[PDB]
Amino acid sequence: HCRGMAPNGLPNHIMAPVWKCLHLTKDFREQKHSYWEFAEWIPLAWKWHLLSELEAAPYLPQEEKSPLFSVQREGLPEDGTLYRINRFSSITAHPERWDVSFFTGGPLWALDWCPVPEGAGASQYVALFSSPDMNETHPLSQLHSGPGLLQLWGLGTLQQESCPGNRAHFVYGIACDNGCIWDLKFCPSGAWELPGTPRKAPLLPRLGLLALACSDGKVLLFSLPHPEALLAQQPPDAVKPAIYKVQCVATLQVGSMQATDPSECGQCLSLAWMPTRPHQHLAAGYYNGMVVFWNLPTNSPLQRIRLSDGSLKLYPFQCFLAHDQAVRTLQWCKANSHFLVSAGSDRKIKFWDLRRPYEPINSIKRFLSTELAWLLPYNGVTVAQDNCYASYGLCGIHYIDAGYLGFKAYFTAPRKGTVWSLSGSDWLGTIAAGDISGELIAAILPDMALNPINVKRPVERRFPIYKADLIPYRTYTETVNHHYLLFQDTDLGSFHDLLRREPMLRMQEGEGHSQLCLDRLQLEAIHKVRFSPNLDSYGWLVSGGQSGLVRIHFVRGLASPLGHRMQLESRAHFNAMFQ
Amino acid sequence: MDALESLLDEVALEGLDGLCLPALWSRLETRVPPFPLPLEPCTQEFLWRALATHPGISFYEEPRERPDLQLQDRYPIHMILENKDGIQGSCRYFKERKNITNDIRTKSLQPRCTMVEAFDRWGKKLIIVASQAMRYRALIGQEGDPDLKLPDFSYCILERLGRSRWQGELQRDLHTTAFKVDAGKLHYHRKILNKNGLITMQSHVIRLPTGAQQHSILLLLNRFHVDRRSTVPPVDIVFERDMLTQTYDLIERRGTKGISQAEIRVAMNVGKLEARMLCRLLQRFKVVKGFMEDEGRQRTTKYISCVF
Amino acid sequence: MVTRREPAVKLQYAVSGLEPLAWSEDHRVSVSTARSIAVLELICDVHNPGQDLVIHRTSVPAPLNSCLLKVGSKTEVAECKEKFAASKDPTVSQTFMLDRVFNPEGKALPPMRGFKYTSWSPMGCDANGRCLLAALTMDNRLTIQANLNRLQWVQLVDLTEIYGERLYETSYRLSKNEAPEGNLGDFAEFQRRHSMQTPVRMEWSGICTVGSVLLAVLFENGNIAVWQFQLPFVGKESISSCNTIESGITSPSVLFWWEYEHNNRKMSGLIVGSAFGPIKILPVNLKAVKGYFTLRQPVILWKEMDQLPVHSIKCVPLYHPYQKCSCSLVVAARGSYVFWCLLLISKAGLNVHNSHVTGLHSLPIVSMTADKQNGTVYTCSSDGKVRQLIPIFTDVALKFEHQLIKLSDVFGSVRTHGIAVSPCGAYLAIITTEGMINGLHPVNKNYQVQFVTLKTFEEAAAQLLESSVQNLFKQVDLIDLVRWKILKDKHIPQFLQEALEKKIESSGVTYFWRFKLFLLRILYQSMQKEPMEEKLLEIQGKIEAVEMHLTREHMKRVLGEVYLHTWITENTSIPTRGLCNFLMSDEEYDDRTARVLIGHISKKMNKQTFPEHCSLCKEILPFTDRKQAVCSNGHIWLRCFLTYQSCQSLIYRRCLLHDSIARHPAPEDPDWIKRLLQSPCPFCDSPVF
Ligand SMILES: [Zn+2]
Ligand SMILES: [Zn+2]
């Protein structure tokens, strides 16, 4: 045990896991990430055909302008001006709190950070998908296959000097034919290289590798070029919201050579990359309940074939029927990549051993589970839940031991509404969660190697980052014509007086008391949350949803002396490695 | 069939209360088909030695000399429940009778007593009982599944029917007199036996000593059966909406005509309790209200959203 | 061609583990299940008119005690487990806490006591003429099971109990000097002491010849333990040796016994496949029998390491027509493809050809079985597609042709979890589950074993009439097709009658007389067991006539056996003069050989009576009737159909069909009578127990 208050105003025993998680993640990434992988898959500029605005318009998300909104901040006299910003427009960062908001032109449905190697200090991006329409909704049973746009948004570089006056820039997007996208995952390491890397004119310095869970029931694998190399190739007269028709690196689909019968698997619904070097396997969950694995380097003429345009088609090497219904989530163990966990519409969380796929390590029945998080240091999994089957008031977020320690599920955060998305930060050891109630909640996990019942009141370990409300000055137009979004943000700089500050007193009415809206669009619903996986910007978070507005925050209270120490030591080593 | 097979079958067709020796002789005498071996003192000793030498056969001293069997052509039940060894059936003295197996036979099952020695020593206190596997097999027959585990009430139904052999039992008398329960309570516990198919339903007519005649259901175990003469369309769950939102929208699409919980279940493709939770939550958020409607046998509930 | 047979066997529990359906040579099906093994044995029941498959059911219980592998002394292991659990490194700590091999039971973890896999021995391995069941739990308890009485399954031995003790008795290394004992506190050595004794899969050899059989157990480490069993197997006493070999394969997945003959040479070796995809044959030389030989060098059948897991292997003997020689076909399920390899010994040694037959399925294969006679292969996947796959010989090696079977036309939308071809290819057993209803999942999941016809009645009749094995019990799956036709149409189809008469006329061997007895008994059943009664009485007369024929023929063997061996002057075990009387009873006995043989016996026999006594009476039992003996008090003893002695013991051996009875072999019986008692019935060619 350790007594006293940290200078950020949380007790030291509450923060001590958060500080420990930095060291454990650093030791892991030193050993089990890598600096370069898939050396053959460098982007080729001639595969990136820029669409004109005339060609792009069918792919563009149909909302040209955001809903009206205002932003309020704890301790700042209220602004109250109604903003309304175009598609691909960003407001400017608040000069001190650095929150940023920008409009994606539709409702946000996939989101991941581009993984930037430890110490690189690179430009920091999010790749995202936003649905073509604010009110249209797609049946799970059907291969939608309607065209849509993958988007890449540069957030600048999130360095301290850069945060004031920052903006989010829509550097480019990819026109996708293969339906709407349900999940996005980058190759967790080794894809990135320096934007200043000298390469021959057809090649472009690679930003990343990105895999898409298409509603068309297949996975698209792209290598992203750095934007500067595209803009150096692009004629300067072209439209700067550049929309590219991009040839896939590989197309991943369930089948076999000469398999005439199209697979019953239906939509792809969740991805996991193999969390450890050399990231050779990609796993996907399917509507028919299967989990499917592709070995991306595979030379074998039984798994790999090349299309006439030179893109790959990959068939899987292994599948198993993990679930009785659609696999809503995969999470792959970082500490040992033989183990994987999944959740499904049959509302069982199943822990798997991929050496022995016929029997799960453990199956725990639960409420209908929407996303899982598995933080490196902890044996168990944290579950976001739909409330439709929950014992009333016991819904929300639970951490669930894989079972050896045998603790009860730690009821980390009660929620009335269904948490749509969940994200852990391995650097922080903390988790954040987006709700239809419109709060974004973040919470600190105890040292889960010790019995969580020793936590006498978990309310001391969570805080609301913001709540989205509709203010009245069944469809999107009939909503926005009569309501505007109010975003009210906490003072993230410290957690002093937290349990007395009004956002907590408000949040304690969101828990338990809050009567759930069911009679309008749920326009405030937060569909995705992602902490940064990158040591640079490790305290940054991105969120968004039915409003189509992304909002970004810096959890200033959790960035710490060890974070600064670790960033500088990694910066020195990185600068010693690449020159 | 083998004589010694039929010997064990007659023992195993009684329940956990088993047979006394005179009851066994009575059962062998009353057997259909006829017992192949004529009963004689040498036979009764020989059959006693066969029973004594059988490892699954077991022996008890009952606290009372049991009354002999009535001729069954046309027992007090004492159900043993949730037994931790998993043995099932009825036996009034189950906790009060004592095993005398090691006294009747060695560990090598060699008989320590003759039939007349044992019957002199104990009379109708001597009970022969077949082990749980033997008794259950005699109820199942060969073709049913030993992996089946029944509710103990439903096993007691079989054990009553099993000992009743070709004569069977009337569902009237089972609920009225044996189990002393309402017909629905028996019927509910009988339905599983029809579902797994262990028993047969016979329409039967009682003729009273008053001269009137009355219908009843005869029940017979399969071994002994002999026929006596005389629009809402379903919802494909969408990705982008939670299950409450999707279920409320269904009810609002139904509106004033409403929908039942059963039709919610069918339309949502969910389990019974899962549909029950969805209804109760939408009631508890007071976005939906339930209204009663007498349909068929029951006042069903149909649900309407508070917009209507 | 494909039609469902009427009974679908419902299972109480979830089907479980690797390749969970198997059909044994003994015509018993087993389903490895989360709480049991369901065992279904198919009876060609002659006692009832029910046209269905008559299936008798039993189950092996899951063991109630969670199996812990022995890796050290209790106190040392307990400290090591606490060390690895308490370790601050995520990799060590979570590799320990997640890998269930280290944690077979825990506080919250579910006990994984159900069954992983099962493998039937050949016939004749049991204490009786039946076959043994190898059964492996998911917590790695390898057990051998047998069904001594009809009701119970009993554990004959636990091999994980033995093998863990043998390793502890050698400090977990096969040669002490080759690797001295590493400290259990090293997690790599802790893990190794589990991996070297975690069974993956097991398979039985053919019968070696006193009989013997080999069980190979494959471990996670790529070690293989070959157990040698003496036959008949009765328990731990029968374990002759346990020899461990190292495959050198990484992450091994499956075994089969490649076992083959060319001229005088008997060749065998293990064929082994990895989860990473290569396939290799190992020469097992570590056996006692002199008649076998083993492969000269390990040979590799597939090298490519493509990470398609080798999920199942099968192999079948084939006489290749154009190469005019004995060859062997290997097939292996590799992801969604079938690898096939044909092995053909010549002056070049192994000539080898291989390929992948391609496009079979849009999902991985989940089970496979092969017709051991024809080499027809069947493959299946959890989308419910099942595909018949026929080898066609080619001037060199093979080409494969395949065709889908439309299970939707017999079952509707279905998931198929496993298939098993019956021993003569008559039936395909299928585990079935509710399928996708046009893109909607089923709410309730239930597992049912379902049987479909592969062969027509005319093919079954032909393969019975032209049978090479000439044994009814081995062909009862084909016989059930004949039985089904008769019970459906209440007559023997005339071409079967004509051909059987021609076979009886031209050859007359007792197989056809046994076939006549079966056909007549099913015919008697078919007309509800009046002219119908006149026909029943007539057919019963024919049954009695062919009963008498088979009795006479068996008596001829018995009487000859008694004549050829030493005469037991005490007449102890055969009613030899009663047999002679029975063989002079009737003027029908035109067989001069029997008539002189009763002369030779009655010359050789003692003039002293040496009668059999009714033990309840100390009174003679005259050889009064074919089926039974009766004393003067009129109480009755059953007749042994093997030796015609009376069965006066309190226990006696009953044929599977209850058609006939046999005495237990006593220590006072001579070897040749003990060999005569170890034989199928005269009437049904099937186990007497
Ligand atoms: Zn007698
Ligand atoms: Zn027989």
Numbering used by the authors:
A (entry chain C): 290 to 762, 785 to 890
B (entry chain A): 1 to 74, 98 to 253, 356 to 433
C (entry chain B): 50 to 258, 271 to 590, 663 to 822
Which lines from the publication concern this structure?
Transcription factor (TF) IIIC, a six-subunit protein complex with a molecular weight (MW) of 624 kDa in humans, facilitates transcription of type 1 (5S ribosomal RNA) and type 2 [e.g., transfer RNAs (tRNAs)] RNA polymerase (Pol) III target genes. TFIIIC is composed of two subcomplexes, τA and τB, that bind two gene internal DNA motifs: A-box and B-box. τA binds the A-box with low affinity and is required to recruit TFIIIB to the promoter DNA. τB interacts with the B-box with high affinity and, therefore, is essential for target DNA recognition of type 2 genes. hTFIIIC consists of τA subunits TFIIIC35, TFIIIC63, and TFIIIC102 and τB subunits TFIIIC90, TFIIIC110, and TFIIIC220. TFIIIC220 forms an integral part of both τA and τB connecting the two subcomplexes via a ~550–amino acid residue flexible linker.
We determined cryo-EM structures of hTFIIIC alone and in complex with the TRR-TCT3-2 tRNA gene. In both cases, we obtained two distinct sets of particles for human τA and τB. Hence, TFIIIC90-TFIIIC110 form, with the help of the TFIIIC220 WH1 domain and the C-terminal zinc fingers in TFIIIC90, a stable scaffold, which stabilizes the WH2 and WH4 domains. TFIIIC110 and TFIIIC90 along with the TFIIIC220-WH1, WH2, and WH4 domains form a rigid τB scaffold, while WH3 and eWH domains remain flexible. WH2 and WH4 of TFIIIC220 are an integral part of the rigid τB-core, formed by TFIIIC90-TFIIIC110 and the TFIIIC220-WH1 domain, and their conformation does not change upon DNA binding, suggesting that they provide the platform for initial DNA recognition. TFIIIC dimerization is likely to be concentration dependent because our MP measurements did not show clear indications for dimer formation at nanomolar concentrations. The observation that TFIIIC dimerizes under cryo-EM conditions should be treated with care because we were unable to evaluate TFIIIC110 dimerization in solution due to a limited amount of protein sample.
